[PDB]
Amino acid sequence: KEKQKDFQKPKLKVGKPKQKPSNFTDTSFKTKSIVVNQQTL
Amino acid sequence: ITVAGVRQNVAELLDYSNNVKKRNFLETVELQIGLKNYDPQRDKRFSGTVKLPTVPRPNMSICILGDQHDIDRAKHGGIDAMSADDLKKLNKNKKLIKKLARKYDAFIASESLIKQIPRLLGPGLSKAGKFPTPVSHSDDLSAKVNEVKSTVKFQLKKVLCMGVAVGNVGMTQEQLVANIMLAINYLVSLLKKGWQNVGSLTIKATMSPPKRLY
Amino acid sequence: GTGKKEKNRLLREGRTPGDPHVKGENFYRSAKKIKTLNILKEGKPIRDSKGKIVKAASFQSKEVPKAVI
Amino acid sequence: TTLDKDLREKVVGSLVLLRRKDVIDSVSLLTTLFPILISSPSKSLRTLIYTKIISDLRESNAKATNHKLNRTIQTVLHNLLTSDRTSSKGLWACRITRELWRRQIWTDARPCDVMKEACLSDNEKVVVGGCRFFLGGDKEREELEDEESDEDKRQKAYEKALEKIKKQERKKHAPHPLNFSALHLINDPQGFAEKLFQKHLQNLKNKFTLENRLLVLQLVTRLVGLHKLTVLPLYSWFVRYLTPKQLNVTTFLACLAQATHNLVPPDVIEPLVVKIANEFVSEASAAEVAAAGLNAIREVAMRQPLCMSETLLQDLVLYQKSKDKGVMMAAKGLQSLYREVYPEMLQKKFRGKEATMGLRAGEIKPLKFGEEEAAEDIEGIELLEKYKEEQKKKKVEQKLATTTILTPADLAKLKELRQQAKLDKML
RNA sequence: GUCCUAAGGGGGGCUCAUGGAGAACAGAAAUCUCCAGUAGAACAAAAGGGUAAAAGUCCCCUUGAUUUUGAUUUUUGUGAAUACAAACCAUGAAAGUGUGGCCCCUUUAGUCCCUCGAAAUUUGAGGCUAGAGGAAGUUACCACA
RNA sequence: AGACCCUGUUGAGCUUGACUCUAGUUUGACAUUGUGAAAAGACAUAGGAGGUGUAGAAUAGGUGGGAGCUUCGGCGCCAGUG
RNA sequence: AUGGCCAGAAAGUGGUGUUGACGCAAUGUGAUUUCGCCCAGUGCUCUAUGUCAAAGUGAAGAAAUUCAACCAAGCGCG
């Protein structure tokens, strides 16, 4: 188990959805708004 | 526990049952056993069967649930029987299955029909603890009824108390005594600590004062 | 103070003898804390009486590895 | 609702302090705290009130079991569940029952009945609370069993055979799998399993999540396996889910393995085994799919061996020549299982030494549906009688169950003789 | 926590993987027939060594997968392997083959084992024999060789 | 023969839930420690009484018999409900 | 004050103390002006089950001895 190959083959797990391919690009992102909490001078 | 004590205990038991006070029916000699130093749930619930040399309850009724050939054998041998058509006409009614389980203390089913008994009678026989004993078309049904009558059952349940029937008053002293040692020895063999887990012993008839072996 | 002994401290924490025990572990220092604070102590080689290095320092090895693909 | 948080937890703590100083009664304190617990919007207030209720129960039942207080609180929780099935307020009673069960304060069958009402409810959270109560206590029972156990070339081959005989004896007398005290304390287990299966699993209108349906299925199958219940529609319900495309099919297969037992007919299990074999072990199937299917088949055959036909068994055992290690080990596990249980279906090549020796000498008998052990005499009684006769012959030089009562030393000697005979038969 | 860490011996019969040509449904693939087929199959090393009337596969009997004593090799005792010596066996018509798988503390027992040293009995202990299990830093205050 | 680096079966000062200890302190028991009352607790026994989730005529700890017991009025088995 | 903080091997021993809270003792901060929240953790401090030493108690044995409860403070809990 201590061996470190250059590429690790993914292991198929039964009863679970198939993982995305290694070349799949994920473009989904989440954004948060920065707010400055100071009253008008 | 001394064997001379065993024979004299059954001696006054038979004396009281037959001479001092006799009921209108045949009283049943029975053994009640307590348990100690033993877990009902976290440990194994021991189960076992042993044939007594003499039939303990000759008045016990046994039904036959088999094929037409087994029905012919049963009516030849004078044993009441029911058919798969009768089980179908019951139509899986829980009340009727409960009535059958109360009416017949034991059931013997053919090998062809035992795999369909839980389909036809649902969970009733398993709930009553009366699941039928298989019989083949080559075995002697009279002999089968003989060991079914002569056998007793030793299953643990949620409490530490057990009660078995080891004979009736009508049989004689020495075969009563033999039934007593086979029952006690089989129970001790089933018990995982043997005599160390045995709480107490008690023998009595259907209506008789108890006699404590232990 | 028997209760302040490290053995009694590990028994009251729950960690069983035979588990790995980093040298210097006490009530204030956990294994992660020791591994963090020993980074500031790394950087020294092991030398003999004549001053030559007999065991190399951290990330200072002298060996040439086999670089193949 | 309107008080400051620190002030309101101070008021709760001061009420608990007055209970400790015995100014007020436990019943008065609990009747004060509990409606605020079930109706408060404040999470911190609910958490502290729950903690104080658990502490009050522990302190009350520490010195002696307060049966009246336990009965009143169990009745209150049962009424809370019974009043509104669709409400989510029963999870507090579920959590209280879990905490008191794990602290072993409540060991009666009444908490089991209350959590039975929790299972038989409409709200998903209280249903899975009751399901987790009956399921996750298996780990606590295993921990308790571990604590109880802590409290309690030819020569090498003979030692290995003796170790195998000791393992067989441990299997004969070891704690039963799928065993839990609350599960045994359930009254009418067949009725409970039927109500659960008809309410949650059968109903397609139920919008339960798949994990929660699996929790209910685990409860139903553990009840059926533990109490040897006969629920025929469950096996027909499993048919759709026995597919490799199904999510958590490993959980479904484990549930079916738990549901199977000895008194289940081979007629209902065999289509399930055939479907698992067709969908899981095939030429186009992946190695992991085949290994999972063969493991599930092995577990089902462990629970009931008569489900399988001899041709299918030989086909599945021949998968041990496969190049995948998992499929190989699964097939060898199935082969070994039928080696101890029923070697007659297995090929003469695959039976092994002991199986062929037993079948040739005639000791091994066919296993049939409904057969129960019917030993007319004690096991090893003939060996004990032979030892007694040898001792009598030695005394002369210098029937056992019929006449003599069983001495405990004689029973130990008979057990030792039976172990020696088993070792000789293995050798 | 479940599961796997592999059935050996004797005798007999037959060849494997694959390719080509054919046969209703049947096609790439279901069963059948012939020809070619040095192992390209299988044998529990995935491209090592070795095996074709077999070391492979099937059938029939069997547990040499048994005790005992030495020798050799890997190198005081082991363990493993190697030829035997004695007995008991298996198989085959027999020659033969087969003695496995192609290559330091804790604790238990001892009838007829020995001591507790003034004598004896009973607990207990010791011995011997045979087993089972498993102790941190800092010094820019410094000092010495 | 300084300062600096390196080595040690290194020395010494200091620190800390490092190891083994200790002054002091705290707690319990015996003694010093006498003369009298009132209370309780824990065991031992000698007993006695009890069981509602629903349904059911009733308020079912459970187990095994058991269709007959009977104090001759009935209680039962049967049926109903579990 | 039958006290707090210290000294002393002990003592019918001593300092504060010929003293008494506007005092004694231990600390931190450091003229004047100006200048919230959290008991999370570690400390300190107050109040029936768990942990529970010695002594004492009960049982077994022929005894050595063994097994049981009971079990103060501290710890834990709050």
DSSP notation for chain B: --HHHHHHHHHHHHHIIIII---SS--EEEEEEEE-S--SSSS-----EEE-SS-S-TT--EEEE--HHHHHHHHHHT--EE-HHHHHHHTT-HHHHHHHHHH-SEEEEETTTTTTHHHHSTTHHHHHT-PPEEE-SSS-HHHHHHHHHHEEE----SSSEEEEEEEESSS-HHHHHHHHHHHHHHHHHHSSSGGGGEEEEEEE-TTS--B---
Q: Does D171 touch chain B (CB under 8 A)?
A: no
- What backbone torsions phi and psi does residue B199 show, to the nearest 5 degrees? -75, -65
| Angstrom distance (rounded) from CA D299 to CA D287 | 18
CA distances (Å), origin D109, targets A3, D57, D114? 54, 18, 9
Distance from CA of D120 to the nearest CA of B (A): 21
Residue-wise over D379-395: b if at least 16 C-beta within 10 A, else e? bbbbbbbebbeeeeeee
Q: Does D232 touch chain B (CB under 8 A)?
A: yes
Instruction: Pick the closest to residue D349 from D324, D311, D314 (CA basis).
Output: D314
Contacts of B52 (CB under 8 A, 6+ apart): B150, B151, B152, B166, B167, B178, B179, B182, B183
Experimental technique used?
cryo-EM
What proportions of chain D, in percent to the nearest 5, are helix, strand and coil? 70, 0, 30
What's the start-to-end Cα distance of chain C, in Å? 60
CA distances (Å), origin D114, targets B105, D96, D196, D236? 35, 11, 15, 30
Q: Does D4 touch chain B (CB under 8 A)?
A: no
Residue of D nearest to A11 (CA): D288
Burial of D361: CB neighbours in 10 Å, binned 0-12, 13-18, 19+: exposed
Q: Does B177 touch chain D (CB under 8 A)?
A: no
Distance of CA D33 to the CA centre of its chain: 37
* B131 in Cβ contact with D370 (< 8 Å): yes
Contacts of D56 (CB under 8 A, 6+ apart): D16, D19, D26, D29, D30
* D77 in Cβ contact with D83 (< 8 Å): no
- What backbone torsions phi and psi does residue D260 show, to the nearest 5 degrees? -70, 145
- Mutation pick from D214, D250, D256, D279 vs chain A, by most beta carbons of A within 10 Å, is D250
| Angstrom distance (rounded) from CA B119 to CA B114 | 9
What six digits make up the tokens of B196?
């160390």
DSSP-assigned states of every residue in D160-171: HHHHHHHHHHHH
Find where tokens 């019929």 sit.
Answer: D402
| Angstrom distance (rounded) from CA D331 to CA D179 | 28
Near strand G (CB < 7 A), which residues?
Answer: C 3, 12, 27; D 6, 13, 16-17, 20, 55, 59, 62-63
DSSP-assigned states of every residue in C12-69: HHTPPBTB---TT--SS--HHHHHHHTTTT----EE-TTS-EEE-BTTB---------
Q: Cβ contacts (< 8 Å) between D372 and chain B: which residues?
A: 49, 133
Distance from CA of B118 to the nearest CA of D (A): 7
Which single residue has its CA nearest the C1' atom of nucleotide E61?
D360
Nearest DNA or RNA nucleotide to C29 (CA to C1'): F17
Torsion of CA D132, D134, D139, D142, to 10 degrees: 180
Structure resolution, Å: 2.9
| Angstrom distance (rounded) from CA B100 to CA B38 | 35
| Angstrom distance (rounded) from CA B177 to CA B73 | 34
Selected residues 120-139 of chain B with any CB under 8 Å from a CB in chain D: 122-123, 126-127, 131-134
Residue of D nearest to B175 (CA): D402
- What backbone torsions phi and psi does residue D255 show, to the nearest 5 degrees? -65, -40
What six digits make up the tokens of B102?
């109360």
Considering only the beta carbons, identify the residue of D247, D252, D286 that sits closest to A16. D247
| Angstrom distance (rounded) from CA D395 to CA B26 | 47
B151-153 and B106-110 strand pairing: unpaired
* A16 in Cβ contact with D247 (< 8 Å): yes
Judge: D376–B51 Cβ closer than 8 Å, yes or no.
Answer: yes
Residue of A nearest to D247 (CA): A15
B106-110 and B62-65 strand pairing: parallel
